[PDB]
Amino acid sequence: EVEETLKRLQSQKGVQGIIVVNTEGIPIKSTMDNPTTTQYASLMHSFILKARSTVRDIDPQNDLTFLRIRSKKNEIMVAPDKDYFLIVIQNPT
């Protein structure tokens, strides 16, 4: 079921890859090449920790809901969860 929905997302014209980060920055599923698989998973793990702390710091009664990062090259979206988040990368062009 979820395998089909992930493929469905991957088929979207914007999406350039999906990484399922599970073990604290170490993913278990990917539709991307190995260097990118680890690159995005690791970097975004560090970032989301900062983003979630940022929310707790700006207000001590709230957690993260979502983050978006945009760049000239590509755009990356992540959502927080109880155990682990998911990374999706799109080509804005």
Binding site: N22, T23, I26, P27, I28, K29, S30, N34, T37, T38
Partner: protein, 46 residues
């Protein structure tokens, strides 16, 4: 009328050299290791 001549002598002494020194230092060197025993994507089945 009786003047007696006498000679007196005191004992000698003995000294010894010695030294003092505060606590000593010594160098040290460390290099932090950067091990990364991390695979790319282990397909877990937890």
């Amino acid at each position: 009328i009786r003047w007696e001549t006498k000679s007196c002598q005191t004992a000698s002494i003995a000294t010894a050299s010695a030294s003092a020194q505060a606590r000593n230092h010594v160098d040290a060197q460390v290099q932090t290791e950067a091990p990364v025993p991390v695979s790319v994507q282990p397909p877990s089945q937890y």
